[PDB]
Amino acid sequence: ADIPANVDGARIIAADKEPGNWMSTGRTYDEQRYSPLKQISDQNVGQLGLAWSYKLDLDRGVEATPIVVDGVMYTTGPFSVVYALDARDGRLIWKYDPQSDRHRAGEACCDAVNRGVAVWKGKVYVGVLDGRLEAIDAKTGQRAWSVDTRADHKRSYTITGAPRVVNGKVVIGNGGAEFGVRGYVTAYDAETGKEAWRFYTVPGDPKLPPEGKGMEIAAKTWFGDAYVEQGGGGTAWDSFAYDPELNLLYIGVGNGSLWDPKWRSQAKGDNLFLSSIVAVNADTGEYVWHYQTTPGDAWDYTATQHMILAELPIDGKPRKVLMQAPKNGFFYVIDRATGELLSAKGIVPQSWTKGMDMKTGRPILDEENAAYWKNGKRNLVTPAFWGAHDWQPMSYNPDTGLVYIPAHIMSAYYEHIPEAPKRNPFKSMYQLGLRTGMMPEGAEGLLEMAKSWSGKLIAWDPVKQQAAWEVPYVTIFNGGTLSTAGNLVFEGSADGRVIAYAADTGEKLWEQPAASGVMAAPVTYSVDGEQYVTFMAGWGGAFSTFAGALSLRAGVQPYAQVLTYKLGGTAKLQEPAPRPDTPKPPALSNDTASIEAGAKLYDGYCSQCHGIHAVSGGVLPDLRKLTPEKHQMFLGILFGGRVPDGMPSFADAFTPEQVDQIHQYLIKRAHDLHQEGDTWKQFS
Numbered sequence: 001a002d003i004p005a006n007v008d009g010a011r012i013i014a015a016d017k018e019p020g021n022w023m024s025t026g027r028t029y030d031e032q033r034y035s036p037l038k039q040i041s042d043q044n045v046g047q048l049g050l051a052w053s054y055k056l057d058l059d060r061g062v063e064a065t066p067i068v069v070d071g072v073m074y075t076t077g078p079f080s081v082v083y084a085l086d087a088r089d090g091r092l093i094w095k096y097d098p099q100s101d102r103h104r105a106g107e108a109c110c111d112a113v114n115r116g117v118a119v120w121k122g123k124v125y126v127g128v129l130d131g132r133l134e135a136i137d138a139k140t141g142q143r144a145w146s147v148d149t150r151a152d153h154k155r156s157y158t159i160t161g162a163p164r165v166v167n168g169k170v171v172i173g174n175g176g177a178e179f180g181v182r183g184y185v186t187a188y189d190a191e192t193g194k195e196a197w198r199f200y201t202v203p204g205d206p207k208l209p210p211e212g213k214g215m216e217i218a219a220k221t222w223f224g225d226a227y228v229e230q231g232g233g234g235t236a237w238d239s240f241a242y243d244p245e246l247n248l249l250y251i252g253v254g255n256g257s258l259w260d261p262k263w264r265s266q267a268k269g270d271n272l273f274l275s276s277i278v279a280v281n282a283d284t285g286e287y288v289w290h291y292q293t294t295p296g297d298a299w300d301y302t303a304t305q306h307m308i309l310a311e312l313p314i315d316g317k318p319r320k321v322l323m324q325a326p327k328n329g330f331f332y333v334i335d336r337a338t339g340e341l342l343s344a345k346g347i348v349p350q351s352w353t354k355g356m357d358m359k360t361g362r363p364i365l366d367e368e369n370a371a372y373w374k375n376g377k378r379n380l381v382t383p384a385f386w387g388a389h390d391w392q393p394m395s396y397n398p399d400t401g402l403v404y405i406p407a408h409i410m411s412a413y414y415e416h417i418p419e420a421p422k423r424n425p426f427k428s429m430y431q432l433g434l435r436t437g438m439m440p441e442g443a444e445g446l447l448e449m450a451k452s453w454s455g456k457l458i459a460w461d462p463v464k465q466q467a468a469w470e471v472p473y474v475t476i477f478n479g480g481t482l483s484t485a486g487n488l489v490f491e492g493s494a495d496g497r498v499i500a501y502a503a504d505t506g507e508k509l510w511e512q513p514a515a516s517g518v519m520a521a522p523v524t525y526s527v528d529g530e531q532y533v534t535f536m537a538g539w540g541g542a543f544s545t546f547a548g549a550l551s552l553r554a555g556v557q558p559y560a561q562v563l564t565y566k567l568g569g570t571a572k573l574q575e576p577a578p579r580p581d582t583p584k585p586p587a588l589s590n591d592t593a594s595i596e597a598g599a600k601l602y603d604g605y606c607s608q609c610h611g612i613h614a615v616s617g618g619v620l621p622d623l624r625k626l627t628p629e630k631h632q633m634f635l636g637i638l639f640g641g642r643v644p645d646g647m648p649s650f651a652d653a654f655t656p657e658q659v660d661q662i663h664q665y666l667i668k669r670a671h672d673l674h675q676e677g678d679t680w681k682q683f684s
């Protein structure tokens with residue numbers, strides 16, 4: 001047998017000769033996520049059945065796109081643990097736990113997720129939460145090399161996305177724009193992990209001369225130097241695409257840090273390359289072209305979203321394009337060689353813009369509704385921080401010419417803080433520089449707000465700039481898609497199931513429960529001529545952690561496991577045990593001032609993980625259902641006693657009295673829970 005995971009440039013480029021394999025996160029460099037396999041089709045997909053499953057170690061967000069090469073599957077679970085499984089029956093071959101430094105677990109904004117690995121010449125590459133990029137021997141399961149990609153240990157840098165390997169170089173970015181960091185993309189040698197090059201996405205100290213054409217161009221679009229301490233943002237924490245013929249690596253750049261443009265860049269400048277699509281030479285990393293989807297990004301509008309390279313008929317002529325549906329709500333068709341904007345259309349309502357100006361390729365700002373930094377109001381904006389589309393991958397099907405997008409219809413308030421926020425030294429707290437996500441505390445209000453949020457699979461036609469068909473979901477954060485030559489599109493839903501639709505009409509043809517929400521993109525491969533289809537299930541991520549209450553509309557519990565199906569499968573689906581009863585809360589406090597003080601601390605230090613207003617999404621602990629014993633050791637826990645479980649220490653940020661204030665607030669919220677509880681039952 002050949003070396004396991006023996007993938008190289010030519011093998012990926014020639015992926016169609018091996019449709020039974022999935023050797024790059026998006027199967028191919030164009031990341032179309034379209035499988036030529038058709039044993040399973042719109043004619044028999046109804047016979048599909050679970051073949052095997054594997055239980056992952058932690059029940060938190062599962063966002064991994066499995067990689068399959070010659071009988072072996074390489075996937076991941078929470079905290080970047082890498083698994084190698086026999087693709088035929090799910091037998092565990094080896095398990096590599098990089099042991100992501102839990103002391104830095106709170107540096108992750110959106111749950112301890114990982115979107116998968118990459119392979120190359122017998123090695124598996126994984127981006128570890130704590131910021132390390134590591135190579136793993138495909139055969140032994142032992143570490144080959146490891147490098148700390150963090151350019152500054154004082155900044156909250158993390159890695160959640162899947163790396164891509166180009167010309168023997170492992171490409172990876174990082175996350176952290178919610179805490180305040182300067183974004184960048186690094187390329188390391190696949191063999192030694194020796195840094196090949198590094199492309200920063202936003203300028204640094206404006207005093208120093210710009211380094212590289214990219215920065216000479218970007219530096220002009222920023223004013224003042226307050227963004228240097230803030231970080232600037234522009235992290236490339238997710239998607240990447242690559243065109244061999246043009247030798248261009250396509251980088252998806254994220255949002256600005258801080259979010260507020262007035263505090264970040266004197267409310268002036270486009271702030272390149274924030275919320276932009278950037279192309280650079282795969283071998284040198286030098287700038288070639290770019291397209292900014294959201295100039296002066298002020299609403300957390302990243303452009304790290306999935307980019308698909310394809311060829312389409314535009315104006316009667318074949319055009320090699322790049323397609324993307326970033327957070328701002330536009331679907332872009334761009335010439336992947338020159339950066340020319342070929343077309344742009346909203347796939348969802350957008351309150352921030354009055355539409356695109358095709359003469360310049362720049363969107364017109366709707367100040368009255370979105371310029372919260374200039375107007376005086378708290379604007380309800382849509383899309384909001386989770387966009388019209390987030391990380392969940394989309395896919396392209398050449399037999400229909402449609403792009404299947406897991407879209408969102410959500411909104412939130414964006415309010416400007418009058419005084420210039422001052423950077424905080426604590427590394428585990430959001431630092432957005434503005435007020436957002438405000439919502440009712442009462443259950444009635446939350447439910448009402450949740451009804452304004454919804455999701456939907458959009459089968460978009462990039463040429464017509466129109467939706468061919470659409471399928472609605474009760475909430476957001478539904479799974480990524482997968483297209484196949486069998487007139488099928490697969491997708492997992494937030495509400496708990498795995499589905500198969502007819503690619504051309506959207507008719508639901510197959511469906512099974514998944515035991516938990518399915519956010520990861522589905523994958524398909526073959527072994528001994530038999531086609532398999534696998535989903536990575538596990539509710540979690542940013543949605544169900546931060547907006548705990550709203551996400552309850554999904555009615556699913558966390559339960560991370562690999563689920564793979566095949567024609568005839570009869571294996572049984574394992575399900576999570578019932579949620580335990582909630583112990584009764586301790587006596588409520590008469591110190592409202594203390595309660596109030598605690599509420600403000602909680603909002604700034606605990607919401608991203610335990611839920612806004614203490615209402616958890618059920619993935620991470622709900623602080624209103626603490627047992628009497630946990631209440632007894634509340635100080636010890638807050639001060640590091642639970643670090644091994646990802647519960648950061650707050651010993652460096654709070655005084656004991658402050659900890660007690662939060663405690664009193666949580667106990668008060670626990671009593672509110674009691675008053676309600678039925679109102680909560682009607683979320684699902």
Ligand code: HEC
Binds near residue numbers: 108602637642645648
């Ligand atoms: C994400 C980085 C977190 C932030 C921010 C806060 N907490 Fe947390 N907390 C987190 C995890 C992953 C866990 C436990 C996971 C497991 O399975 O063990 C916890 C746990 C707690 C607990 C104990 C709950 C229980 O055992 O029932 C408490 C009391 C707690 N956390 C409090 C707390 C407070 C007050 C926070 C804001 C200052 C806070 N947490 C933030 C993850 C994260």
Ligand SMILES: O=C(O)c1cc(C(=O)O)c2c(n1)C(=O)C(=O)c1cc(C(=O)O)[nH]c1-2
Binds near residue numbers: 063110159160176
């Ligand atoms: O600003 C950043 O650096 C950054 C990083 C990440 C991450 O690494 O997961 C997310 C986001 N932003 C983000 O804006 C977002 O909506 C998001 C959702 C998720 C998820 O896993 O569901 N991650 C992230």
Ligand SMILES: [Ca+2]
Binds near residue numbers: 177178254300302
């Ligand atoms: Ca962000």
